[PDB]
RNA sequence: GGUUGGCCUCGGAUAGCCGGUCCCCGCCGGGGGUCCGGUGCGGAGUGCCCUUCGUCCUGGGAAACGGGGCGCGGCCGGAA
RNA sequence: UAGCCCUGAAAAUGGAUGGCGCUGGAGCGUCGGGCCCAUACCCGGCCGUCGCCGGCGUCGAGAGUGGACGGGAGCGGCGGCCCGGAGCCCCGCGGACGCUACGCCGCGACGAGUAGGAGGGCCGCUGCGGUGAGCCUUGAAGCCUAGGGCGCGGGCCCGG
RNA sequence: AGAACUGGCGCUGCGGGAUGAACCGAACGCCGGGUUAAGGCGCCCGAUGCCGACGCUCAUCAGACCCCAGAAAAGGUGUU
RNA sequence: GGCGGGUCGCGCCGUCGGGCCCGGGGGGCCACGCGCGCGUCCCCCGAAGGGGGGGACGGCGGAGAGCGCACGGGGUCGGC
RNA sequence: CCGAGUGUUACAGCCCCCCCGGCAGCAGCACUCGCCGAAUCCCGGGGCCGAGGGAGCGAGACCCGUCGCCGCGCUCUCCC
């Protein structure tokens, strides 16, 4: 299996034409001429009894619902969320100081690390300057500040992913006794592994931070608007 | 009614020549651009090699 | 209902502002020479707080007034 | 001579470039680039009307804009010892909705209205012939209702 | 008062003319987004809060936008 | 002896036009049975009135198997 | 003696205009030549508002029409 052999210059236009591609593919010498399991039978198991039982499984349904909706009308390409495309703004390169706008943090300044497979850009300001763990944040809820730090070769744990950062609930009790789920008081003590693998990235973001003259005082601070300070008059 | 002039491949259902008219005007305005960027260099290059 | 306050010259505009030696008004104010700045930088397109997450460990620079006060005691300025 | 301004230029309730006001214009003339919003125009939804239709093939076996048999002659192709021949579905016995034809569906264009004229009314009132093996003293009619709804409306249904 | 031609009002809402039968745009099923016409854009009142252009004009009764709602002959070493 | 109208040949212009062609000495093409024979054209070998080539053909002699993708594709889903 | 402001005649001893011959090499350009533009035209990014509504000629289909039209890729040959 060769590669595409026709590089797209613009989205969905090949660089080579129809007859230019008949020769790049050598189509002039490859025109061609040459030209269910329902169920294995189950055995008898019995006296006065033969005929290893007939081919039947996955039988007809017990109950047809009284009415049904018709089938849908097929549409083109509306592929689910695991398959669309992932995008960034050009102002957010790895190493960018971000400004969180909307969380529980609300103005804490963090360091952008890696853009995950879901568009949620993984980020941490360190836990010693801020109080920000390795949280995901959404892309369009930050502000890319025009200062950077080179963290191009920091390290990255492969185990931290979209499946790593999730939230969990498992509804066992169907009875309306007065427990609050019996385990949603549990602020998460799964931190025992999360406390290990932030130190494995804290230890080598901070020497990048401590090499800039006063960048670490800049990350303890929070962002605010005060009196004559207007965005659109402002350079972030 | 999806719009011609705004998406491709509706034009190509109405006009197949619209695609080959379109990469011909993308191939040439890339080589008219590679010519003019190099020529604007080619004056101030030896004008700097003078200085 | 609001998301920090500015605690103040008079004014001129074919002109004004600052700093200033000298001789006149109970140790302060009136004048002129002189030095300044001026599409006002001794610029409310500005200024002081400040964008203060807190604490501990822990060294420098800066600072010898302490800063909030339920303090107690005093005075004297602001009547449109 | 002609532009602006002034004189000519006097009316009775207190008064009207609409007012407040306006003089490096918020006046007049000649222009510019922005900008504002009609039920008008464009795109989309939904309602009705009108025009041109579709589907009785519920035909999961229906397949036909050309069609068969079976004989006179030729192949490419399916199984060779260069001679060769219809298989009716079945290892699954299965396969949504529909079509009150006075119904259902599709597409397109249109929608001011007095006097007036037609149509539709499962709008409503009273009584009759049929009909609901209707409803009710375990509560009918009527009336009332910050109760819940439906219909574009006429109105209607339910709760108390 | 009475005709001609065409459009309107009467039978017709809506945007502008402050106000309104007839003027100027435009005709109307119930809405959402876009754009405009006539007309505007100091503040009532949406929009010039453009670093708009060029001139003319001072009134002790200035002037200010179709129909439309106030003026003539004559005159001014008032200014252009 | 001058001036217009129609006609011919001369050299001169234009990214002329005929896909032109005809032979000779990189970019583009929705243009693809080597075997050879059906018409038609062309270039050729010495002849002198034959053959061999290539080209294009709207005719015939040379002349299937669709597999698994992706999609500005018959009016949005998410297996967020 | 220099510096400065006026008034005069004089055509280089600041310059400016009209010619008679040239080069870099020309950009509708170092935001005034802004012109008029696109078979002489494409690319990319934002903001808003809406998402209305049994397609299987094939398999005799079968858990479950990712289907037509359109535009593409790879393999059913090899090598680097
Ligand atoms: Mg009537
Ligand atoms: Mg008119």
Q: Cα-flanking dihedrals φ and ψ of residue A123, to 5°?
A: -155, 145
Q: Is some CB atom of chain A closer than 8 A to the CB atom of B23?
A: yes
**Paired tokens of A204:** 């080598």
CA of A35 to C1' of F64 (A): 7
User: DSSP secondary-structure letter at A53?
Assistant: B
Determine the Cα angle at A27 with ends A7 and A4, to 5°. 20
Q: Is residue A137 within 8 Å of A123, Cβ to Cβ?
A: yes
DSSP track, A140-199: GGEEEEEEE---TTS---TT-STTTS---------S--S-STTTSS-----HHHHTHHHH
Method: cryo-EM
Q: Cα-flanking dihedrals φ and ψ of residue A8, to 5°?
A: -75, 125
To one decimal place, what's the resolution in Å?
A: 3.1
Closest CA to A159 of A131, A127, A198: A198
- The number of beta carbons lying within 10 Å of the beta carbon of residue A151 is 19
Helix spans in B1-51 (H): 11-14, 17-50
Q: Is some CB atom of chain A closer than 8 A to the CB atom of B28?
A: no
DSSP track, A191-235: HHHHTHHHHHHHTTTHHHHHTSTTHHHHHHSB----SS--TTS--
Place of tokens 């007859």: A19
Q: Cβ A17–B8 below 8 Å, yes or no? A: no
Q: Cβ B23–A12 below 8 Å, yes or no? A: no
Half-sphere exposure of B21 toward its Cβ, with a 13 Å CA cutoff? 8
Determine the residue among A13, A14, A75 to mutate to test chain B binding: the one whose Cβ has the most chain B Cβ atoms within 10 Å.
A13
CA distance B18 to chain A (A): 11
* Gap between the Cα atoms of A203 and A217, Å rounded: 18
Q: Is residue A101 within 8 Å of A223, Cβ to Cβ?
A: no
């Amino acid at each position: 299996p060769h590669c595409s052999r026709n590089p797209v210059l613009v989205r969905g236009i090949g660089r080579y034409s129809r007859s230019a591609m008949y020769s790049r593919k050598a189509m002039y010498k490859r025109k061609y001429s040459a030209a269910v399991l329902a169920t294995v039978t189950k055995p008898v198991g019995g006296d006065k009894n033969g005929g290893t039982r007939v081919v039947k499984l996955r039988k007809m349904p017990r109950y047809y619902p009284t009415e049904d909706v018709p089938r849908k009308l097929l549409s083109h390409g509306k592929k689910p969320f695991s398959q669309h495309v992932r995008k960034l703004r050009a102002s957010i390169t790895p190493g960018t100081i971000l400004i969180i706008l909307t969380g529980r943090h609300r103005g804490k300044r963090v360091v952008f690390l890696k853009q995950l497979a879901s568009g949620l850009l993984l980020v941490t300001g360190p836990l010693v300057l801020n109080r920000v763990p390795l949280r995901r944040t959404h892309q369009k809820f930050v502000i890319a500040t025009s200062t950077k730090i080179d963290i191009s070769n920091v390290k990255i744990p492969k185990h931290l992913t979209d499946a790593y950062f999730k939230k969990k609930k498992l509804r066992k009790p169907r009875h309306q006794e007065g427990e609050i789920f019996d385990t949603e008081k549990e602020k998460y003590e799964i931190t025992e592994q999360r406390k290990i693998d932030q130190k494995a990235v804290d230890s080598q973001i901070l020497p990048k931070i401590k090499a800039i003259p006063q960048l670490q005082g800049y990350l303890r601070s929070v962002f605010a608007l005060t009196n004559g300070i207007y965005p659109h008059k402002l350079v972030f | 009614k999806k719009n011609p002039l705004k998406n491709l491949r509706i034009m190509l259902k109405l006009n197949p020549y619209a695609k080959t008219m379109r990469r011909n005007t993308i191939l040439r305005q890339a080589r008219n651009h590679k010519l003019r960027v190099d020529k604007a260099a080619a004056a101030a290059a030896a004008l700097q090699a003078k200085s």
